[PDB]
């Protein structure tokens, strides 16, 4: 069975969303929906996801931009992992 | 030193043409270190990156020619290019003239000057084009 979250997308623009807009970027499995990416991020990091924006990258993988709520901080999540 | 990237960024931040941005020939090295959009914004406020003004076709000679042609001059038979019916439309000239005569006879019936029978005589003759202008209509009403 396939896993949703593969690995985090850690690029310079992935920081411009982490610092400024409180968003965590992951490169997920292409068969996953915005609702499946949402539940998956919560069940692995104990956070609260408000919005998920997807894009099908030119690498065949799916890039998921996950926005957290004010109660959780993106800069603080990227530290432990 | 290639500042062509900054020239693309300067033209978006100042929202003006690419051929209009001015870079200070003395500040090249400081424009070279300009990586980000904010680096370009700061260098605008420093006065190093300015934008040239857009020209406008000076209507000065045009206005002075609009004056003379409105007075009736310069429209001589050696300055006409298009045919007569091209300079003034025939159907449009009728529309102008006939409504002008139908705006007159209306103001005359609703004033008591003309009667219902006298108005009919003239309206059908106006629609028949018996009167050139409103002036020829009056030169017919008065006997």
């Amino acid at each position: 069975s396939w896993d949703v979250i593969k690995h985090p997308h850690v690029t310079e623009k992935a920081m411009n969303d982490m610092d400024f807009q409180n968003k965590l970027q992951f490169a997920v499995d292409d068969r996953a929906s915005k609702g499946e990416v949402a539940d998956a991020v919560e069940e692995q990091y104990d956070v609260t996801v408000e919005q998920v924006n997807t894009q099908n990258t030119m690498d065949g993988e799916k890039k998921a931009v996950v926005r957290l709520s004010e109660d959780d901080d993106a800069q603080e999540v990227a530290s432990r992992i | 030193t290639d500042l062509s990237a900054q020239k693309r960024l300067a033209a978006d931040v100042l929202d003006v043409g690419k051929n209009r941005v001015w870079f200070n020939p003395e500040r090249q090295g400081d424009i070279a270190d300009a990586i980000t959009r904010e680096d370009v914004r700061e260098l605008v406020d420093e006065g190093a990156i300015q934008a040239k003004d857009k020209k406008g076709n000076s209507r000065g000679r045009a206005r002075e020619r609009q004056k003379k042609r409105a007075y009736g001059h310069q429209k001589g038979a050696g300055s006409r290019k298009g045919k007569a019916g091209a300079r003034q439309n025939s159907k449009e000239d009728w529309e102008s003239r006939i409504r002008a005569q139908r705006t007159k006879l209306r103001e005359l019936r609703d004033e008591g000057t003309l009667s219902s029978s006298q108005y009919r005589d003239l309206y059908d003759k106006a629609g028949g084009g018996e009167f050139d202008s409103v002036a020829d209509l009056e030169r017919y009403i008065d006997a």
Partner: protein, 46 residues
């Protein structure tokens, strides 16, 4: 031209096929990419 999902997955792989033979394979075999494609001179599928 509008590409579909699969068409994208394919054009994506073709781009990774355009990567050179890494520096270490030369040092391991003790001394050529044959699927060398250009965006102008060559033709892909579809």
């Amino acid at each position: 031209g509008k590409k579909s999902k699969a068409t994208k997955k394919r054009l994506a792989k073709l781009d990774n096929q355009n990567s050179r033979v890494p520096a270490w394979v030369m040092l391991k075999t003790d001394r050529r990419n044959h699927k060398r494609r250009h965006w102008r001179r060559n033709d892909t599928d579809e």
